[PDB]
Amino acid sequence: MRAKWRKKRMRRLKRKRRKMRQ
Amino acid sequence: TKKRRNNGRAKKGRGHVQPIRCTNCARCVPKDKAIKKFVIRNIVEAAAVRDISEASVFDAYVLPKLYVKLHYCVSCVIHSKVVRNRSREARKDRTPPPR
Amino acid sequence: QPIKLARVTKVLGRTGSQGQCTQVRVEFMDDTSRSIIRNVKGPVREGDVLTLLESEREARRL
Amino acid sequence: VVDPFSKKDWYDVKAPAMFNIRNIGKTLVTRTQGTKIASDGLKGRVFEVSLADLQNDEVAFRKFKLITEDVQGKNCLTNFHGMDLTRDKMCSMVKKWQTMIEAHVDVKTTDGYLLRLFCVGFTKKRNNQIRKTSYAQHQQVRQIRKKMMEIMTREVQTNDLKEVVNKLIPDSIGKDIEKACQSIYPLHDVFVRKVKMLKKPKFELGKLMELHG
Amino acid sequence: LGPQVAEGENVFGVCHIFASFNDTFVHVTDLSGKETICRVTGGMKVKADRDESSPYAAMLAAQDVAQRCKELGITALHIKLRATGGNRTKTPGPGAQSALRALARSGMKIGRIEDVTPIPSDSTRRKGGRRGRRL
RNA sequence: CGCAAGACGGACCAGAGCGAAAGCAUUUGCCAAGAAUGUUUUCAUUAAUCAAGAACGAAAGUCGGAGGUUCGAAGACGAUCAGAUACCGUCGUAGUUCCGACCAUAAACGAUGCCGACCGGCGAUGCGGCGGCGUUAUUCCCAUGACCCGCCGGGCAGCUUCCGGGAAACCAAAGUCUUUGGGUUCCGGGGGGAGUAUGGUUGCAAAGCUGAAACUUAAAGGAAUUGACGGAAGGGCACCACC
RNA sequence: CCCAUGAACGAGGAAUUCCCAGUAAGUGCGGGUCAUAAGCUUGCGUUGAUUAAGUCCCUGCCCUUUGUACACACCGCCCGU
Known part of the structure; x- marks a missing residue:
C-alpha cells in the first residue's frame, strides 16, 4: 500500500474516533 | 541509488525553478529539467517548395522560416525518441549528437 | 507531363517498407549540369536509362 | 439567386x-x-x-x-x-547567448499624433571573442535602454508624422541607437520593433490630401 | 462581379490558413481582412471528423477556395498561416502544407508568406492538468 | 476594427545570479537592506555552536473583505471497459488572484548540520580588484566601455586522478578513522505494531509538536553481479518471416 | 473388371501452409506397409515453371543497452476490501 494512502486512512480513522469521543 | 549527479536537471545554486507546460501533454515540468528543442524549419515543406516558388509573384522571395520552441517532459521526450536511454557510462556524455 | 531520360551514375541504396525501391542518382543527358535522386521500382542497373513521368518530383534522400 | x-x-x-x-x-x-x-x-x-x-x-x-x-x-x-x-x-533575431534590450516611449509628434515606439536591440559578440556569451550587466542594459528612449523621443517629438514615417522607412532611429550604444555595449540588431497609433488629432481632410501629394 | 482591371495585372487577397489539429480553415479575405471572398473548411469536404484535419480535406478546400477566388477576379494571395496558438500548440496542423500546395497548384499566384499564430507574452493556465494529458 | 476584465510575464533564460530557507524574471522611480572585492581606516577577543525562546517558512487548507480571465478538487454528463465510482472529452463549485488573520507542514533534497585547519591537477563561469601586446566606440589624447592574455580573492559548478575513504554506488569530500580525541548542536539502535493509542500542548477547524505498550516476527533492508522478464530503446537474422 | 438412372463445380468465407533452378508442380515404379494388398509416408526417376538476389513491416528467434521489488525467474511478485 502507498504510504500516503495509509496516512489518509489513519487520519480518517482519527476523525471517526473524534466523532466517537466528543 | 542515485542515477545522475545532477538529478536529471540543472538546479545548481538555487532552490526553486519556475515550471513550464509540456508542449505534448501539458505536464508541469521544471524549466531546467524539461528537454528543450528549438526547431527552425521552412514554413513550406520540401515538396511544396517547388510549386510555391513557381507560383510566387516575386523573384527570389525566399520563404520565411518557422521558429518553434518545444519543451518536452521526460516521458514525452522519451516516447517521441527525442532522447533515449543510454548505458551507465554513456549517460555522462553531454555533447549533443552531431546531426 | 513530358517524358525524359537520365543516365544512372551511382546506385545509392535499397529502401522500402519490405524493400522494393532502389534509390539512385541520375544525370540528365540534355543538360548534364543537373542531377536528381529517384527511387525506381523493380530490378535496376548501373549506367542504364530510366523513364520518368515527372522531372520536378524527388523521393527522400538518406 | x-x-x-x-x-x-x-x-x-x-x-x-x-x-x-x-x-x-x-x-x-x-x-x-x-x-x-x-x-x-x-x-x-x-x-x-x-x-x-x-x-x-x-x-x-x-x-x-x-x-x-x-x-x-x-x-x-x-x-x-x-x-x-x-x-x-x-x-x-533572438539568439540564446546574448541579451535583448527592449525599450518603449509614448511620444507625441508636433501635429498631435501620439505614438508608442518600441525599440529592440541585442548585444554583439566581438570578432575575436572567445567567451561563449556576450551578456551586458544590468546597469549597462539600463544605460542602453535610456539611450534608446532618449534617441527615440528626440527623433519623434521634434518632427511631424510625415518626417517620422520618412525616418521609419530606412529605420534611421535604429541605426542612430546602434551608433550611440557602442560606447556602452556593442549592439547587434537594433530596430524600432513596433509603432502603434495611440492617439490621433482631429481629422482634417486638408492634411490628408497634403499627405497624398 | 470582378474588379474593373483585368487579370493580366495581379489583384491581391489574403488567405488566412488556420491549421488546427482538428480541421483546416482556408479563408480568403480582402487585403484589409475585413471583407471575405470565400471561407471553406476541411470539415465541409469530408463526412468524418477523423479526416476533418487530413491533408486531403485541406487540399480540397484550397482547390475550391482558389476556384471561387478566380471566379471573382483574385489572381494572387497573401498567405497568413496560423496554428491554434494561445497556450496550445504553435505548430500548424497536418493540413497547412497541403492547403498551401493545392492553393499554389490551382492556378494561383503566391504573394508574401507570414506566420500569425497567437503567441502570448505569457498566458493563462493551459487546459491540461499539472500532470497533463495521460493518454 | 475596437472596448472591458482578470490572470501571467514567453522567446532572451544558462548545470548563470541573488536570498537563511521557503523563494525570486516587463519598464521606471522611491525605500531600507546585503554579500563579495578594495582598504598601511577603526575597536580590540567583542568569537563558534547552541536547551529555553523567537523571526521566516512552497502548495494545499481555514476564517472575514475584494475580485473573479483562465485552469480546476468535488459534482453533472459523454465516452472506453467484463466492470471504471479512473485514465480521455464537454461543462463546472470550492479553490486558483489580491488584502488582513490563521495553519507551520513537503522527496521543505545535496535525501549530506554549522564553524575551523590541512590535503592533487585542469579548463571554464559570476562578482570585485590588479597587471599587460593588440582590436573596436565615444569623430582625435588619456579615462572608461566591448573584446584578448594572465593573476588574486570569495561564489555556482564541471572534468580528471592509485589523495584517501567506502559494502559498493560513488565522494576532493562522504578524505586527513583500530596510526581511532579541533569545537559544538540535532539525531539513529533488527523489521512490524506505529508516528498508532494515551496524556499534555497549540489551532476556529484540518491538524501540528511531544509520543508508547501489549503483541508479533527471522529477517526486513543497502549496494553491486548473473540470469529471466518488460504493453523499453537500438541493432541482426530467417520463404517452418515478409516483399 | 463391364453395364445405366448420377450431384455443387465462371477463380472457391474471414483467414492461411509449403516454396527459389532441374524448383512449385502433374505421373508412374520398389518398400514400412503385405496373404495380390495404398487414399499415408518414404525413395526413385519422369515432363518441368515468370515474379527473388531484397528488407525488418505483419510473424518469430537472437544480440546490445536499459528497468526490475522477478530468481519456483511475468503462468513471477504483490496491495487492499
Whole structure:
C-alpha cells in the first residue's frame, strides 16, 4: 500500500474516533 | 541509488525553478529539467517548395522560416525518441549528437 | 507531363517498407549540369536509362 | 439567386506620398443602400503592407499598417497607422547567448499624433571573442535602454508624422541607437520593433490630401 | 462581379490558413481582412471528423477556395498561416502544407508568406492538468 | 476594427545570479537592506555552536473583505471497459488572484548540520580588484566601455586522478578513522505494531509538536553481479518471416 | 473388371501452409506397409515453371543497452476490501 494512502486512512480513522469521543 | 549527479536537471545554486507546460501533454515540468528543442524549419515543406516558388509573384522571395520552441517532459521526450536511454557510462556524455 | 531520360551514375541504396525501391542518382543527358535522386521500382542497373513521368518530383534522400 | 458579390464595388487603396508605390491594392465593399453608406464601411480599414510592396528598395520584414481616413472617387486614401516587424525576423533575431534590450516611449509628434515606439536591440559578440556569451550587466542594459528612449523621443517629438514615417522607412532611429550604444555595449540588431497609433488629432481632410501629394 | 482591371495585372487577397489539429480553415479575405471572398473548411469536404484535419480535406478546400477566388477576379494571395496558438500548440496542423500546395497548384499566384499564430507574452493556465494529458 | 476584465510575464533564460530557507524574471522611480572585492581606516577577543525562546517558512487548507480571465478538487454528463465510482472529452463549485488573520507542514533534497585547519591537477563561469601586446566606440589624447592574455580573492559548478575513504554506488569530500580525541548542536539502535493509542500542548477547524505498550516476527533492508522478464530503446537474422 | 438412372463445380468465407533452378508442380515404379494388398509416408526417376538476389513491416528467434521489488525467474511478485 502507498504510504500516503495509509496516512489518509489513519487520519480518517482519527476523525471517526473524534466523532466517537466528543 | 542515485542515477545522475545532477538529478536529471540543472538546479545548481538555487532552490526553486519556475515550471513550464509540456508542449505534448501539458505536464508541469521544471524549466531546467524539461528537454528543450528549438526547431527552425521552412514554413513550406520540401515538396511544396517547388510549386510555391513557381507560383510566387516575386523573384527570389525566399520563404520565411518557422521558429518553434518545444519543451518536452521526460516521458514525452522519451516516447517521441527525442532522447533515449543510454548505458551507465554513456549517460555522462553531454555533447549533443552531431546531426 | 513530358517524358525524359537520365543516365544512372551511382546506385545509392535499397529502401522500402519490405524493400522494393532502389534509390539512385541520375544525370540528365540534355543538360548534364543537373542531377536528381529517384527511387525506381523493380530490378535496376548501373549506367542504364530510366523513364520518368515527372522531372520536378524527388523521393527522400538518406 | 442571391449573390452578395454582385452588390459589391471595388475601390483602389492609395498610400501616402511617403512611399514610392501608391496603389497598395483593391478593396471591395457592398454598394450603398440607405443609411448603410459604402464610405463608412470602408473608412477605418487597416492594411498591413510590407515595405517591399510599398518601396522599390526596402526590406520586406518591415510592415506598415495604413488606415483609410477618407474615400473619394472609388479611391481610398490611407494614412499611417502603425509599424511592425514580421514574426520570422523577430524570431530569428533572438539568439540564446546574448541579451535583448527592449525599450518603449509614448511620444507625441508636433501635429498631435501620439505614438508608442518600441525599440529592440541585442548585444554583439566581438570578432575575436572567445567567451561563449556576450551578456551586458544590468546597469549597462539600463544605460542602453535610456539611450534608446532618449534617441527615440528626440527623433519623434521634434518632427511631424510625415518626417517620422520618412525616418521609419530606412529605420534611421535604429541605426542612430546602434551608433550611440557602442560606447556602452556593442549592439547587434537594433530596430524600432513596433509603432502603434495611440492617439490621433482631429481629422482634417486638408492634411490628408497634403499627405497624398 | 470582378474588379474593373483585368487579370493580366495581379489583384491581391489574403488567405488566412488556420491549421488546427482538428480541421483546416482556408479563408480568403480582402487585403484589409475585413471583407471575405470565400471561407471553406476541411470539415465541409469530408463526412468524418477523423479526416476533418487530413491533408486531403485541406487540399480540397484550397482547390475550391482558389476556384471561387478566380471566379471573382483574385489572381494572387497573401498567405497568413496560423496554428491554434494561445497556450496550445504553435505548430500548424497536418493540413497547412497541403492547403498551401493545392492553393499554389490551382492556378494561383503566391504573394508574401507570414506566420500569425497567437503567441502570448505569457498566458493563462493551459487546459491540461499539472500532470497533463495521460493518454 | 475596437472596448472591458482578470490572470501571467514567453522567446532572451544558462548545470548563470541573488536570498537563511521557503523563494525570486516587463519598464521606471522611491525605500531600507546585503554579500563579495578594495582598504598601511577603526575597536580590540567583542568569537563558534547552541536547551529555553523567537523571526521566516512552497502548495494545499481555514476564517472575514475584494475580485473573479483562465485552469480546476468535488459534482453533472459523454465516452472506453467484463466492470471504471479512473485514465480521455464537454461543462463546472470550492479553490486558483489580491488584502488582513490563521495553519507551520513537503522527496521543505545535496535525501549530506554549522564553524575551523590541512590535503592533487585542469579548463571554464559570476562578482570585485590588479597587471599587460593588440582590436573596436565615444569623430582625435588619456579615462572608461566591448573584446584578448594572465593573476588574486570569495561564489555556482564541471572534468580528471592509485589523495584517501567506502559494502559498493560513488565522494576532493562522504578524505586527513583500530596510526581511532579541533569545537559544538540535532539525531539513529533488527523489521512490524506505529508516528498508532494515551496524556499534555497549540489551532476556529484540518491538524501540528511531544509520543508508547501489549503483541508479533527471522529477517526486513543497502549496494553491486548473473540470469529471466518488460504493453523499453537500438541493432541482426530467417520463404517452418515478409516483399 | 463391364453395364445405366448420377450431384455443387465462371477463380472457391474471414483467414492461411509449403516454396527459389532441374524448383512449385502433374505421373508412374520398389518398400514400412503385405496373404495380390495404398487414399499415408518414404525413395526413385519422369515432363518441368515468370515474379527473388531484397528488407525488418505483419510473424518469430537472437544480440546490445536499459528497468526490475522477478530468481519456483511475468503462468513471477504483490496491495487492499
